[PDB]
Amino acid sequence: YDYLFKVVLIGDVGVGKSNLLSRFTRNEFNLESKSTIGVEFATRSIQVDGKTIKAQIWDTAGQERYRAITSAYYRGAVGALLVYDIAKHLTYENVERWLKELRDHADSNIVIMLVGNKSDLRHLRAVPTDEARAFAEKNGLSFIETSALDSTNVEAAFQTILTEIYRI
Protein backbone atom coordinates (compact mmCIF):
# COMPACT_ATOMS: atom_id res chain seq x y z
CA TYR A 1 0.00 0.00 0.00
CA ASP A 2 1.10 3.67 -0.51
CA TYR A 3 -0.72 5.26 2.47
CA LEU A 4 -2.64 4.15 5.62
CA PHE A 5 -5.81 6.04 6.37
CA LYS A 6 -7.41 5.40 9.80
CA VAL A 7 -11.14 6.09 9.50
CA VAL A 8 -13.69 5.81 12.36
CA LEU A 9 -17.39 5.02 12.33
CA ILE A 10 -19.48 6.91 14.92
CA GLY A 11 -23.25 7.42 15.27
CA ASP A 12 -25.95 6.20 17.65
CA VAL A 13 -26.55 2.65 18.70
CA GLY A 14 -28.27 0.62 15.95
CA VAL A 15 -27.66 2.86 12.89
CA GLY A 16 -25.63 0.17 11.10
CA LYS A 17 -22.01 1.04 11.66
CA SER A 18 -20.68 -2.49 12.14
CA ASN A 19 -22.50 -3.71 9.06
CA LEU A 20 -21.07 -0.76 7.06
CA LEU A 21 -17.74 -2.01 8.30
CA SER A 22 -18.44 -5.68 7.42
CA ARG A 23 -20.06 -4.81 4.11
CA PHE A 24 -17.01 -2.80 3.10
CA THR A 25 -14.23 -5.09 4.38
CA ARG A 26 -15.59 -8.65 3.93
CA ASN A 27 -18.72 -7.92 1.82
CA GLU A 28 -20.64 -9.82 4.59
CA PHE A 29 -23.88 -8.63 6.21
CA ASN A 30 -25.83 -9.68 9.29
CA LEU A 31 -29.44 -8.88 10.11
CA GLU A 32 -28.88 -10.45 13.53
CA SER A 33 -25.96 -8.25 14.67
CA LYS A 34 -25.73 -7.45 18.40
CA SER A 35 -24.47 -4.13 19.89
CA THR A 36 -20.69 -3.91 19.57
CA ILE A 37 -18.50 -4.90 22.55
CA GLY A 38 -15.29 -2.94 22.98
CA VAL A 39 -13.61 -1.65 19.84
CA GLU A 40 -12.91 -3.33 16.51
CA PHE A 41 -11.09 -2.53 13.35
CA ALA A 42 -10.67 -4.09 9.96
CA THR A 43 -8.72 -3.12 6.88
CA ARG A 44 -9.25 -3.12 3.16
CA SER A 45 -7.15 -1.78 0.26
CA ILE A 46 -8.43 0.27 -2.54
CA GLN A 47 -7.33 2.45 -5.32
CA VAL A 48 -7.61 6.20 -4.97
CA ASP A 49 -6.32 8.54 -7.76
CA GLY A 50 -3.72 5.92 -8.79
CA LYS A 51 -2.63 4.91 -5.27
CA THR A 52 -3.12 1.96 -2.98
CA ILE A 53 -4.71 3.17 0.30
CA LYS A 54 -5.02 0.72 3.14
CA ALA A 55 -8.23 1.87 4.90
CA GLN A 56 -8.18 1.05 8.60
CA ILE A 57 -11.79 1.37 9.75
CA TRP A 58 -12.60 1.44 13.38
CA ASP A 59 -15.88 0.69 15.00
CA THR A 60 -17.40 0.56 18.47
CA ALA A 61 -20.72 0.71 20.33
CA GLY A 62 -22.63 4.05 20.19
CA GLN A 63 -23.44 3.65 23.92
CA GLU A 64 -21.69 6.13 26.28
CA ARG A 65 -23.52 5.95 29.69
CA TYR A 66 -21.03 4.53 32.14
CA ARG A 67 -18.17 4.10 29.67
CA ALA A 68 -17.15 6.96 27.31
CA ILE A 69 -15.24 6.65 24.02
CA THR A 70 -11.87 8.31 24.58
CA SER A 71 -9.48 10.22 22.38
CA ALA A 72 -7.45 7.07 21.81
CA TYR A 73 -10.27 5.83 19.68
CA TYR A 74 -10.03 8.88 17.47
CA ARG A 75 -6.32 9.23 17.61
CA GLY A 76 -4.69 9.56 14.18
CA ALA A 77 -8.05 9.34 12.36
CA VAL A 78 -8.15 11.31 9.04
CA GLY A 79 -11.79 10.46 8.33
CA ALA A 80 -14.99 10.03 10.23
CA LEU A 81 -18.11 8.27 8.93
CA LEU A 82 -20.90 9.88 10.88
CA VAL A 83 -23.84 7.53 10.42
CA TYR A 84 -27.49 7.97 11.26
CA ASP A 85 -30.62 5.97 10.47
CA ILE A 86 -32.86 7.54 7.87
CA ALA A 87 -35.87 5.81 9.55
CA LYS A 88 -35.27 7.02 13.14
CA HIS A 89 -35.33 10.77 13.53
CA LEU A 90 -33.56 10.84 16.91
CA THR A 91 -30.40 9.42 15.27
CA TYR A 92 -30.28 12.30 12.78
CA GLU A 93 -30.94 14.66 15.68
CA ASN A 94 -27.94 13.32 17.54
CA VAL A 95 -25.58 14.23 14.70
CA GLU A 96 -24.98 17.50 16.66
CA ARG A 97 -23.72 15.44 19.54
CA TRP A 98 -21.36 13.40 17.30
CA LEU A 99 -20.02 16.59 15.77
CA LYS A 100 -19.49 17.83 19.28
CA GLU A 101 -17.63 14.59 20.11
CA LEU A 102 -15.57 14.96 16.85
CA ARG A 103 -14.59 18.50 17.83
CA ASP A 104 -13.73 17.17 21.27
CA HIS A 105 -11.73 14.08 20.56
CA ALA A 106 -10.56 14.14 16.90
CA ASP A 107 -8.18 16.22 14.80
CA SER A 108 -9.33 19.67 13.71
CA ASN A 109 -8.62 18.45 10.12
CA ILE A 110 -10.63 15.22 10.05
CA VAL A 111 -12.75 14.75 7.00
CA ILE A 112 -16.30 14.05 7.99
CA MET A 113 -18.96 12.35 5.91
CA LEU A 114 -22.56 12.34 7.04
CA VAL A 115 -24.02 8.93 6.08
CA GLY A 116 -27.81 8.31 6.17
CA ASN A 117 -27.81 4.50 6.21
CA LYS A 118 -30.66 2.01 5.62
CA SER A 119 -31.94 3.56 2.39
CA ASP A 120 -33.65 0.27 1.41
CA LEU A 121 -36.22 1.34 4.00
CA ARG A 122 -37.47 3.94 1.46
CA HIS A 123 -41.03 3.77 2.84
CA LEU A 124 -40.11 4.11 6.53
CA ARG A 125 -38.17 7.38 6.01
CA ALA A 126 -38.26 9.94 8.80
CA VAL A 127 -35.44 12.07 7.26
CA PRO A 128 -35.65 13.64 3.83
CA THR A 129 -32.54 13.41 1.66
CA ASP A 130 -32.61 17.10 0.83
CA GLU A 131 -32.89 18.24 4.44
CA ALA A 132 -29.82 16.20 5.39
CA ARG A 133 -27.93 17.26 2.22
CA ALA A 134 -28.59 20.83 3.28
CA PHE A 135 -27.44 20.18 6.84
CA ALA A 136 -24.23 18.66 5.50
CA GLU A 137 -23.61 21.64 3.18
CA LYS A 138 -24.30 24.07 6.09
CA ASN A 139 -21.80 22.23 8.35
CA GLY A 140 -19.14 21.57 5.74
CA LEU A 141 -19.41 17.79 5.64
CA SER A 142 -19.77 15.44 2.70
CA PHE A 143 -23.08 13.57 2.41
CA ILE A 144 -24.32 10.21 1.20
CA GLU A 145 -27.17 7.74 1.75
CA THR A 146 -26.38 4.01 1.96
CA SER A 147 -27.84 0.58 2.46
CA ALA A 148 -25.49 -1.94 4.00
CA LEU A 149 -28.34 -4.47 3.64
CA ASP A 150 -28.75 -4.30 -0.12
CA SER A 151 -25.14 -3.10 -0.55
CA THR A 152 -26.04 0.30 -2.21
CA ASN A 153 -23.47 3.16 -2.14
CA VAL A 154 -21.33 1.46 0.46
CA GLU A 155 -18.03 1.10 -1.46
CA ALA A 156 -18.87 4.63 -2.78
CA ALA A 157 -19.21 6.14 0.72
CA PHE A 158 -15.78 4.81 1.53
CA GLN A 159 -14.05 5.62 -1.78
CA THR A 160 -15.38 9.22 -1.58
CA ILE A 161 -14.14 9.90 2.01
CA LEU A 162 -10.81 8.32 1.17
CA THR A 163 -10.49 10.40 -1.95
CA GLU A 164 -11.37 13.60 -0.12
CA ILE A 165 -8.75 12.77 2.48
CA TYR A 166 -6.10 12.05 -0.16
CA ARG A 167 -6.84 15.39 -1.90
CA ILE A 168 -7.02 17.65 1.27
Ligand X SMILES: Nc1nc2c(ncn2[C@@H]2O[C@H](COP(=O)(O)OP(=O)(O)OP(=O)(O)O)[C@@H](O)[C@H]2O)c(=O)[nH]1
User: Max CA-CA distance within the chain?
Assistant: 44
| 120 CB burial (10 A radius; 0-12, 13-18, 19+) | middle
Q: Do 104 and 134 form a contact (C-beta atoms < 8 A)? A: no
CB 140, min distance to ligand X, A? 24
Check residue 63 for interaction with Mg ion (CB under 5 A). Answer: no
Pairing outcome for strands 3-10 and 79-85: parallel
Is 68 a binding residue for a copy of itself by CB under 8 A? The answer is no
Shortest distance (Å) from residue 31 CB to a copy of itself = 8
117 contact, one of Mg ion, ligand X, a copy of itself, none, CB 5-8 Å limit per kind: ligand X
Decide if residue 17 touches a copy of itself (CB under 8 A): no
25 is an interface residue for Mg ion by CB under 5 A? no
18 near Mg ion, rule: CB under 5 A: yes
Three-state SS at 142: strand
